[PDB]
Each structure stands twice: as structure tokens, then as C-alpha cells.
Amino acid sequence: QTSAVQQKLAALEKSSGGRLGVALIDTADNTQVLYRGDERFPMCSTSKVMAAAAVLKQSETQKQLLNQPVEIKPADLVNYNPIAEKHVNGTMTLAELSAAALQYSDNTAMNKLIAQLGGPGGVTAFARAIGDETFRLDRTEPTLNTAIPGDPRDTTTPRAMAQTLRQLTLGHALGETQRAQLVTWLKGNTTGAASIRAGLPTSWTAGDKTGSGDYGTTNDIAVIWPQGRAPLVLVTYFTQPQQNAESRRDVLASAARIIAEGL
């Protein structure tokens, strides 16, 4: 079937010129709304959630892991390092790296998370351990954002990512302490106000992680507490046909608005 909401999302997609993927889980009733829910999209920096969560999982059996220092060398800096560049020739802890990756979208910090997990495949292994058979991380930053149409590397589907984000933030994929830390980090994101959150009523609250890459790829994944309602999990992924296309955070906002209006 095609619902009213799916029809509205299709119309948004058509006027955007790109390809839109949406997955909602409403934890009021566990129902789902999907649009291209089983198509693959480049994750870009939304993959930082999986990496940080995998390190949180490791910390369950090492109480001091998040206080562990990681050397930041001049050679480690990549293309977007607003936090790590302050610490070059010094150290950051794994908590600091997780917070920088999630809240500032620092790519050097993400690379240290990936290295802590033994490379991109360590992030995929954690996804499999928590029931996500779809997610794959194949490369480090910055090349994981190439976002080439048809390229399976560094992709997932909206359905899989929504289910994962639910399990991480609201369910029991992590220990209680760790889940609370992940939620705190997401709620403190600095980069999200133009994306999903711009489409929601202002009384609501949320935590999110954005991403962007080539092909005008513009992504956001969020856990949302609507006023007076059980929480939602929402993924909005968007990618465009030309390598040099401009980001379109407004499309994510519009998708979120359609979703919110359909509750």
C-alpha cells in the first residue's frame, strides 16, 4: 500500500530532484513508516553513532576505557577537525573523542574511534552483534563520504538504521549507563538545528546526528520526544545525482514535518 504520508514524501522527493529515504518508528505503538526504507544510502557522518556506541559497548567491561588517552599527532588531522586540532601533540580520551565525533562531527575523532575498534570492520562487527545485518563501514574518514551512487561501501538502509538507533538509545543494546551517555551526547549535538529538528514543533525535544558528503548527500538520524507522546526514532537520508550537488538540509526538515503531521 501507499499511505498519505508516503505520497507526500514522494512529492517532496520529486520536487527535490534527489533520492529520499525515510524510516520512522513510533514507540507509542511500535509502528513504522518507511519511504525507500530498504534502499541503500551512504551514511556519511551518521555512522559516527555506530562507532561511538561500539566503544561504549567495549567500556562496559573496562571502567577506565573512556578515560584512556589517545595520542593526536599532526599527521592524524584530516579534513574537518575542530576539536582534534586543539589537541595535536597531546592526547584526548576516548570519551573526548566520542563527544567530539558526535557533537561536533570531528573526523579525526571518528578515525580514533574506528582505530580503537580495529578498523571499519570492527564497527560493522558491532552492528552485527546488536542485530543489524545491513550496516557496513568499509573506509575511514574522509573517504567514507564519497557517496557514489550504486556504491555499497559505507551504506545502510533507513529501516536498519532506525531499528539500530532505537535499540541503542531506547532499548538494551547498551548497558543502562552507556545508553544514557549516548542519549546525553546526541541531545547535546551542535549541528542539527537545520535538519530533522527544523521540521518538528518547537515544543518537542530531540537528539540527532547529521551527515553529509559528495553527491549533495544530506542525512540526519534522531531520537525525538514529542510533547505528550512516547519517543520516535527517525532517519532521513537524501542523495543527489551530481557529485558537486549542494547540501539540502531543508529537504530533511520537510520530511520530518510530513512525518510529524502524520501522527
Site residues, ligand 0JB (CB under 6 A)? 45, 79-80, 105, 107, 141-142, 145, 191, 210-214
Residues in the chain: 263
The three three-digit cell numbers of residue 156, written as one number? 545502510
- Residue closer to ligand 0JB by CB (options 6, 210) is 210
CB of 38 to ligand 0JB, least distance (A): 24
The least distance separating ligand 0JB from the CB of residue 149, rounded to whole angstroms, comes to 14
Nearest to 171 by CA among 11, 18, 25, 8: 25
In the bound state with ligand 0JB, the residue whose beta carbon lies nearer, of 59 and 254, is: 254
Q: Quick count: other Cβ atoms within 10 Å of Cβ 153?
A: 16
Distance CA 18, CA 80 (A): 26
Active site residue 45: yes
3-state secondary structure of 108: helix
Residue whose C-alpha is closest to residue 137's, from 146, 125, 147: 125
Surface-to-core class of residue 208, CB atoms within 10 Å of its CB (0-12 exposed, 13-18 middle, 19+ buried)? buried
Which of residues 16 and 191 has its CB atom nearest to ligand 0JB in the complex? 191
CB of 233 to ligand 0JB, least distance (A): 18
In the chain, the DSSP E strands lie at 19-26, 31-35, 41-42, 69-72, 90-93, 155-156, 205-213, 217-225, 232-239
Nearest-approach distance from CB 67 to ligand 0JB, in angstroms: 25
CB nearer to ligand 0JB: give 9 or 221: 221
- Whichever of 41 and 80 has its CB closer to ligand 0JB, that residue is 80
Q: Which of 3, 15, 16, 45 is catalytic?
A: 45
Contact by Cβ (8 Å): 37, 19? no
Taking the complex as a whole, how short is the minimal distance between the CB of residue 194 and ligand 0JB, in angstroms? 10
- The helix (run of H) or strand (run of E) holding residue 251 is helix 249-261
- For the bound state, the minimum distance from the C-beta of residue 129 to ligand 0JB, rounded and expressed in Å, comes to 25
Nearer to ligand 0JB, 6 or 108 (CB): 108
Q: If we measure between CA atoms, which residue out of 248, 239, 240, 257 comes closest to residue 24?
A: 257
Question: How far apart are alpha carbons 94 and 71 in whole angstroms?
Answer: 10
Residues labelled catalytic: 45
